[PDB]
Amino acid sequence: MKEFYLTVEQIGDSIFERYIDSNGRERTREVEYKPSLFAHCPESQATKYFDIYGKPCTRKLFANMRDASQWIKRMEDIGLEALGMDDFKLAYLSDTYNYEIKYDHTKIRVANFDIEVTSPDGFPEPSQAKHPIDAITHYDSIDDRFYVFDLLNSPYGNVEEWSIEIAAKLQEQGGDEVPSEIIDKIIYMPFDNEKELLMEYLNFWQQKTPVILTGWNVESFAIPYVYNRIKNIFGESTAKRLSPHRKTRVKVIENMYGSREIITLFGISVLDYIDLYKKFSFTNQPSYSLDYISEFELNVGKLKYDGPISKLRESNHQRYISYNIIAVYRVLQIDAKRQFINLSLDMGYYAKIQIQSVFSPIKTWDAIIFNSLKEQNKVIPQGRSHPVQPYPGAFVKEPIPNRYKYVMSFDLTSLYPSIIRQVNISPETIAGTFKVAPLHDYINAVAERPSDVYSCSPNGMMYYKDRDGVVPTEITKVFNQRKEHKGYMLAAQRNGEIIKEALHNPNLSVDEPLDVDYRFDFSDEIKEKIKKLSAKSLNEMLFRAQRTEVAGMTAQINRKALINGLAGALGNVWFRYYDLRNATAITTFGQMALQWIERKVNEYLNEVCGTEGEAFVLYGDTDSIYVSADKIIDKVGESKFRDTNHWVDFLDKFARERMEPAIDRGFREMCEYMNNKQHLMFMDREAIAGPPLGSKGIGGFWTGKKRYALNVWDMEGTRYAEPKLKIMGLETQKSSTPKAVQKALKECIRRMLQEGEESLQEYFKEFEKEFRQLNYISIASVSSANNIAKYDVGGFPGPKCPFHIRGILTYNRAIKGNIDAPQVVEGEKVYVLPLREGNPFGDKCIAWPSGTEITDLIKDDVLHWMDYTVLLEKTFIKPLEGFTSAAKLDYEKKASLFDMFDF
DNA sequence: CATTAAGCAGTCCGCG
DNA sequence: GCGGACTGCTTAA
Ligand SMILES: Nc1nc2c(ncn2[C@H]2C[C@H](O)[C@@H](COP(=O)(O)OP(=O)(O)OP(=O)(O)O)O2)c(=O)[nH]1
Ligand SMILES: [Ca+2]
Ligand SMILES: [Ca+2]
Ligand SMILES: [Ca+2]
Ligand SMILES: [Ca+2]
Ligand SMILES: [Ca+2]
């Protein structure tokens, strides 16, 4: 088999590499790497090395990495460019693996762990690690085993061994309901003292040294806690055994009233699952407890226990250990669905970077581009310092706030990467400039043609048409991968709807789910079989289809993020290829493209409808247009349609067969105007929206820019079994909006769009009457808690103190003296509730850590003093007022002359 | 070591 | 009480 790295580190003049050899064995080696860098040399110098602008370079081979570093400094002092890869481990990986890396994940040791630490005096700080570690569960992906290290004797209590038999039993039978499918994979190890637990865990760690180290919050809690506890008990040399190279780095972060630390373990790639989730999931969650995320991802209930976690081990050691095990497994379950570890491995090996560098788009692209250029014997430019400079982005159209009955939307495929490729935007393809006219002159095709020789952007840049750019070349590779996965995702999505349609008529039989590949549209034969399947088999198939869709989503959306990240990176001062000429060439071209096609679509639709000067395009943002389709429907007449699906089909056909070709013609002209390298402006129909035929639904509304709701029947070729709400920007979409309020506002919207004003009025009345009965957590607002210290004046709010911070300070006063109350952590999220006048907390609101019940000693008073009137007004009524006034609709029946009568 | 556009909630302040 | 700067937060793209 081909060899591949596991980890790589630079320690002084040594490269330390863990790798898999040709026999598939894990190996380690220390290499005294001899790096090369480059200097510009005279033209008369015969060389095989050229910089990206074609200037000749001489290679300088150094005896060691320090020598190479010191030469860089001398060159800086001289005032001459020192070219080449300055991150030497990237050069090392490039030299060692001079081929496309084909890796085997089964040979990669992925470790998932978590620890338990009983603490009678508040949160057990990792930097101090003053309490015993009393449990570790460590799952190893090679053994496929949960290794459980259980402390039986502690200063905080002596306990009996955990029982696997009780653990497997249903909770309703007094058990812990440890999932049956892992019961046989648990290796249980009790310990009479912490020293032998820890010693044995370290020996175990040596035998089974993680390559990928993950788990929930491992980087901020488990890793630094274990490292520090071992340091305190055995000494720091022993703690360094957690590094296969015995080298660590301690990062102390000062928070005025916190002081925590992160530990770098050289030769291990830590990918904290919370960080992976935040980066790759494209959610913004109100809480990041494993409980909350597990419920969201897996629809599993919270791990329940009685009393505080500080007393769980002594009162219920059986449950304590089971919950430690289950928490480890839950992360594995989330990853089985989301596949972020797989994604990280794919991306890291593709780029030839340390796996943990997938968190950095700049590092990822630096390595991809370096590897591409190195292949052509080209030499990369030195990184330079640049002052931070704001620059212009996308165009957003101001919509007229209103209801919009029939809407069809269109948007550009992968816009910014497509612009890069169409225009040929790269550091080394710049051909010169032209004299800019105002943007609106390009939009309206009145400005002089920029160039008849080079490929142009309306920002004034010109690019070579007849040569490849590393940026277009490498962005295309990732785009093509992205396109493949999105195809799989969309096929699975359409397949899902086929199954959902079939679930309307399930067959009364005993059968099995069809063995199919959900990444491809079902054949006619498969569809015929599906129509004869039982509900049980259909529901199993639907789970499999959705799981396939999620996998495709992870794969496509994060590749989309990577390529959009390159367009953004051009505008980041730390990027080797930072260049506002290139960054603005993209954004400015995008603004022209949107407004050009707005014009073209208005012209086309007026023509085919036989009118003049009517505005069909009601809105647009960055690369999308929203077309009012009322006049299209009215042209044929609503009466002609048999049902909703009839007009949906009609608009679908209209968009594909009439509008899209016209759009294509419009963009091809634009391409010729800018004399671009390749026409890649592909604008396809996105949504078809409207009310159910014969209903009083309004179909859609806009309140303003980035704020709208649409009742969608077809999205990007997926014909829904049931209409789906597309809501963007409104409070239903925001993590700061109370959970029950998101739900109620969405139902208000559903009623508006699908049923009409009276239906809305009926729901509002009901919700207002029942609001006070909702659980306090379901009606609490949410906010991130940043710069808490800044506004803290003796426990009271300083000037300009934000509302949520005021709540935190109220909470801090209420819990002061009590050691057993949960502390608010700087930068994390809190629930927030307004408080009635004269409350015993002595302020207008309280805030506490999100995803938690508010501590028992103050929960009673919060409930009593909660301001329901303020909460309803602020979170529910005011946003609804926004929606309904925009839609020209009332949520409460207004007074009328009819009030004089008895109905 | 490492993208911009834009809406809304809230504080401070002016206001016989 | 409610608008106009200005901060903070969180979206859409
Ligand atoms: N830097 C950066 N730019 C973004 C991001 N999301 C969107 N944009 C910019 C670049 C996109 O090309 C453009 C249009 O956004 P879309 O959401 O329509 O995505 P895009 O067209 O890239 O892909 P698509 O094929 O429509 O899924 O807006 C992002 O997360 N980061
Ligand atoms: Ca725990
Ligand atoms: Ca798009
Ligand atoms: Ca059937
Ligand atoms: Ca879009
Ligand atoms: Ca599309």
Number of H helices, E strands in chain A: 27, 33
How far apart, in Å, do the first and last CA atoms of chain A sit?
84
A414 Cβ closer than 6 Å to some ligand 1 atom = yes
A728 Cβ neighbours under 8 A, 6+ residues apart:
A706, A707, A708, A709
The answer to whether A285 CB is within 7 Å of strand C is no
**Side-chain half-sphere CA neighbours of A112 within 13 A:** 25
Is residue A898 one of the residues assigned to a domain?
no
Q: Count CB atoms within 10 A of the CB of residue A555.
A: 21
DSSP H or E run through A898: none
- The answer to whether the CB of A572 is under 6 A from ligand 1 is no
Q: Which of A239, A176, A208 is nearest to A112 (CA)?
A: A208
Nearest alpha-carbon partner for A410 in A648, A659, A636, A582? A659
- Domain shared by A177 and A251, yes or no: yes
Identify any residues that bridge with A412 across adjacent strands, giving them in sequence order: A683
- Residue A281's SS3 state is coil
> Closest Cα to residue A37, out of A13, A61, A55?
A61
CATH of the domain at A508: 1.10.287.690
Answer yes or no: are the C-beta atoms of A220 and A272 closer than 8 Å.
yes
Residues A633 and A717 reside in one and the same domain: yes
What are the strands, taking DSSP E only, across A496-573?
none
d(CA A477, CA A556): 13
Tokens of A45: 């110098």
SS3 A264: strand
What's the number of domains chain A is made of?
6
The nt closest to A564 (CA vs C1′) is: B3
* A419 CA to centre of ligand 1 in angstroms: 12
Q: Could you give the CA distance from residue A892 to residue A238 in angstroms, rounded to a whole number?
A: 70
Nearest protein Cα to ligand 1, atom 19 = A414
Final residue of a domain: which of A510, A538, A572? A572
Domain of residue A221, CATH code: 3.30.420.10
Whether A737 maps to a domain, the answer reads: yes
Strand C closer than 7 Å to the CB of A176? Answer: no
The set of residues, in sequence order, having a beta carbon less than 8 Å from that of A9 and lying 6+ positions away, is A15, A16, A17, A89, A245, A247, A266, A267
Contacts for A630-635 with beta carbons within 8 Å, 24 or more apart? A630/A405, A630/A406, A631/A605, A632/A406, A632/A605, A633/A406, A633/A690, A635/A609
> Which among A523, A521, A518 is positioned nearest to A549, based on CA atoms?
A518
Domain's final residue, options A339, A366, A393:
A339
Residues A548, A690 share a domain? no
Exposure of A68 by Cβ count < 10 A (0-12 exposed, 13-18 middle, 19+ buried)?
buried
Place of tokens 């803290």: A792
Q: Which nucleotide is nearest to A786 (CA to C1')?
A: C8
Outline where A503-534 has alpha helix (H). Answer: 524-530
User: What is d(CA A75, CA A307) in angstroms, rounded to the nearest whole number?
Assistant: 65
Tokens of A99: 């081929």
For Cα atoms A535, A536, A539, give the angle at the middle one, nearest 5 degrees.
Answer: 80
Half-sphere exposure at residue A404, Cβ-oriented, CA atoms within 13 angstroms? 29
**Within a domain: A559:** yes
Q: Which stretches of A755-877 are DSSP H helices?
A: 757-770, 803-814, 856-865, 868-871
Strands A269-270 and A212-214: parallel
Residues A483 and A552: their CA atoms lie apart, in Å, by: 10
Closest CA to A802 of A814, A784, A817, A818: A784
- Distance, in Å, from the CA atom of A467 to the CA atom of A64, rounded to the nearest integer, reads 37
Reference A372, options A17, A642, A94, A58; nearest CA is A94
Instruction: Write the CB contacts of A290 (distance below 8 Å, at least 6 apart in sequence).
Output: A216, A327, A330, A331
DSSP-derived pairing of the beta strands A212-214 and A110-116: parallel
The rounded distance, in Å, linking the Cα atoms of A29 and A3 is 14
Query: Any long-range contacts for A341-344 (C-beta under 8 Å, 24+ apart)?
Result: A341/A110, A341/A212, A341/A214, A341/A271, A341/A276, A342/A105, A343/A280, A343/A554, A343/A555, A343/A558, A344/A212, A344/A271, A344/A276
Q: What is the DSSP letter of A83?
A: B
- Using the structure, give the distance in angstroms from the CA atom of A807 to the C1' atom of B12, rounded to a whole number: 19
Q: Is residue A318 a part of any domain in this protein?
A: yes
Give just the sign of the alpha carbon dihedral A535, A539, A544, A549.
Answer: positive
Element (H, E) at A486: helix A470-502
Atom number of ligand 1 nearest to Cα A486? 27
Tokens describing residue A707: 């704020």
CA-CA distance, A882 to A507, in Å (whole number)? 47
**Nearest residue for B4, CA–C1':** A393
Helix (H) or strand (E) holding A329: helix A309-338
Work out the burial of residue A890: count CB atoms within 10 Å of its CB; fewer than 13 is exposed, 13-18 middle, 19 or more buried: middle
Same domain, A98 and A141: no
The values of phi and psi at residue A445, to 5°, are: 60, 35
Nucleotides of C under 7 A from a protein CB: 7-13
CA R_g for chain A:
31
For residue A540 the two structure tokens come to 């199993």
Question: Are A476 and A566 in a shared domain?
Answer: yes
Q: Exposed, middle or buried: residue A637 (CB in 10 Å: 0-12, 13-18, 19+)? A: exposed
Experimental method: X-ray
Instruction: Give A587-615 as a DSSP string.
Output: HHHHHHHHHHHHHHHHHHHHHHTT-SS--
Distance CA A155, CA A624 (A): 64
CA dist A384 and A553 (Å) reads: 37
Same domain as A436, residue A484:
no
DSSP state of A443: H
* Residue spans of beta strands (DSSP E) within A539-579: none
Q: What is the amino acid identity at position A322? A: S
> CA A782, A271, A20 angle in degrees (round to 5)?
165
The whole-angstrom separation of Cα A157 and Cα A554 is 45
- Would you say A543 and A552 are in contact if contact means Cβ atoms under 8 Å apart? no
Residue A845 has φ and ψ, to the nearest 5°, of: -165, 160
Q: Report the separation in Å between the CA atom of A475 and the middle of ligand 1, taken as the mean of its atom positions.
A: 14
Rounded CA-CA distance A261/A125 in Å is 10
- What is the residue type of A864? H
- Is residue A216 within 8 Å of residue A273, measured between CB atoms? yes
Residues A766 and A854 in one domain: no
Give the mutation target among A622, A682, A685, A706 for probing the ligand 1 site: most ligand atoms within 8 A of CB.
Answer: A622
Same domain, A235 and A322: yes
Please give the Cα distance from A453 to A464 (Å, whole number): 8
Q: Is the CB of A363 under 7 A from strand B?
A: yes
Among A305, A339, A373, identify where a domain stops: A339
| Contacts of range A869-875, beta carbons closer than 8 Å, 24 or more positions apart | A870/A834, A871/A738, A871/A779, A871/A833, A871/A834, A872/A768, A872/A771, A874/A781, A874/A834, A875/A731, A875/A737, A875/A738, A875/A741, A875/A779, A875/A781
Separation CA A603–CA A585 (nearest Å): 27
Residue of A621, A599, A581 whose CA lies nearest to A395: A621
Note down the domain range covering A448: 383-468+573-729
Between CA A297 and C1' B9 the distance (Å) reads: 30
What amino acid is encoded at A97 in this protein?
Y
- Cβ atoms A754, A692 nearer than 8 A: yes
Question: Is the Cβ–Cβ distance between A296 and A285 less than 8 Å?
Answer: yes
- The token pair that represents A746 in the structure block: 């969405």
The answer to the question of residue A900 being in a domain is no
A762 lies in the same domain as A849: no
Q: What share of chain A is helix, strand, coil (3-state, %, to 5)?
A: 45, 20, 40
List, in order, residues 6 or more apart from A846 with CB less than 8 Å away. A807, A810, A811, A814, A832, A833, A835, A854, A858, A862
Alpha-carbon distance of A752 to A341, in angstroms, equals 42
Kindly state the greatest CA–CA separation across chain A.
103
Q: Are A224 and A184 in contact (CB under 8 A)?
A: no
Q: Is the CB of A487 under 6 A from ligand 1?
A: no
Q: Are residues A368 and A388 in the same domain?
A: no
Sequence letter at residue A557: I
A137, burial (CB in 10 Å: exposed 0-12, middle 13-18, buried 19+): buried
Amino acid letter for position A264: T
Residue nearest to nucleotide C6 (CA to C1'): A800
In DSSP notation, A363-375 reads HHHHHHHHHHHHH
Residue A902 lies in a domain: no
Q: How many residues are present in chain A?
A: 903
In angstroms, rounded to a whole number, what is the distance separating the alpha carbons of residues A165 and A899?
70
Residue A402 bridge partners (DSSP): A702
Q: What are the Cα distances from residue A340, in Å, to A109, A332, A488, A548, A820? A: 16, 11, 17, 14, 36
Quick one: which of A151, A148, A114, A145 has its CA closest to A131? Answer: A151
Angle value at C-alpha A295, between A289 and A299, nearest 5 degrees:
165
Residues with their C more than 2.5 Å from the N of the next written residue in chain A, i.e. before a break, are none
Q: Distance (Å, rounded) from C-alpha A459 to C-alpha A480?
A: 28
SS3 A177: coil
**Same domain, yes or no: A90 and A120:** no
Between CA A777 and CA A852 the distance in angstroms is: 9
Query: Probe ligand 1: pick from A282, A413, A416, max atoms within 8 Å of CB?
Result: A416
- Give domain status of residue A164, yes or no: yes
Residue A572, CB, less than 7 Å from strand B?
yes
**CB of A686 shorter than 6 A to ligand 1:** no
Which of A378, A383, A349 is closest to A366 using CA atoms?
A: A383
Residue to mutate, A623, A685, A706, A728, ligand 1, most ligand atoms under 8 Å from C-beta: A623
Shortest CA to C1' contact from A574: nucleotide: B2
Distance measured from the CA of protein residue A745 to the C1' of nucleotide B13, in angstroms = 34
- Cβ distance A672 to A681 under 8 Å? no
Write down the residue that tokens 């920029």 correspond to: A450
Q: Are A756 and A697 in contact (CB under 8 A)?
A: yes
CB of A45 closer than 8 Å to CB of A34: no
Find all residues with CB under 8 Å of A902, minimum gap 6, and list them: none
3-state secondary structure of A865: helix
Instruction: Give the CB-side neighbour count of residue A488, counting CA atoms within 13 A.
Output: 20
Q: Which nucleotides of B are covered by protein (CB under 7 A)?
A: 1-12
Residue A134 counted as domain residue: yes
Q: Please report, for the domain that includes residue A73, its CATH number.
A: 3.30.342.10
Answer yes or no: do A103 and A143 share one domain.
no
Q: Classify the C-alpha dihedral A751-A752-A753-A755 as positive or negative.
A: positive
Residue type at position A340: F
Q: Which atom of ligand 1 is nearest to the CA of A419?
A: 12
